Amino acid sequence: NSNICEVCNKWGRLFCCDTCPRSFHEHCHIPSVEANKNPWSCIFCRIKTIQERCPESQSGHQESEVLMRQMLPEEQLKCEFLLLKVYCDSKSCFFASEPYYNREGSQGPQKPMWLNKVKTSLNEQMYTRVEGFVQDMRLIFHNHKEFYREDKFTRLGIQVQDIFEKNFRNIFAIQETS
Ligand SMILES: [Zn+2]
Ligand SMILES: [Zn+2]
Numbered sequence: 001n002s003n004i005c006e007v008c009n010k011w012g013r014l015f016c017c018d019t020c021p022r023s024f025h026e027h028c029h030i031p032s033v034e035a036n037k038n039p040w041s042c043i044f045c046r047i048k049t050i051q052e053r054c055p056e057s058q059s060g061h062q063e064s065e066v067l068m069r070q071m072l073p074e075e076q077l078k079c080e081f082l083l084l085k086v087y088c089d090s091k092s093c094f095f096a097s098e099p100y101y102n103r104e105g106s107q108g109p110q111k112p113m114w115l116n117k118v119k120t121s122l123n124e125q126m127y128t129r130v131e132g133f134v135q136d137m138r139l140i141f142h143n144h145k146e147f148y149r150e151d152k153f154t155r156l157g158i159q160v161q162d163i164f165e166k167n168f169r170n171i172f173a174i175q176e177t178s
């Protein structure tokens, strides 16, 4: 197994996957690494199993259909994996914790949003459809772009949204287009 967390790339108290060489801090894995379970399989491995059981699940889909799906166990898992892919980028630090807004010439968003809030919402089963999770994720970056205006810091929102969107299209097998 790797000697660093797959998510934050640091050493520490690491839990090792039994079916792949990845390792995780307890609360870096999503869901948080389960208490007992020998053997244990990481979210990467669980996702790969879904695909292997239903190869046709990789055929292209329309985003509108994906958003309307109810959050049954496989969709819950796919949104947890997509959230975890965003935390894997170091630039997620800017979006992780609760923001505050006091900048001359800007007003804060009407509905603030942040990664740890989406993480608790998933853990508490607060989303009934994929659309609810996706809308809160996109809201994080939209709030950032609107608040930072012409400051070059706006680019951090475009960068982390690009990671989200590429991973959304991969995980939910969105039909490729020009
Ligand atoms: Zn970690
Ligand atoms: Zn694994």
Ligand SMILES: [Zn+2]
Binding pocket: 053, 054, 055, 056, 057
């Ligand atoms: Zn199948």
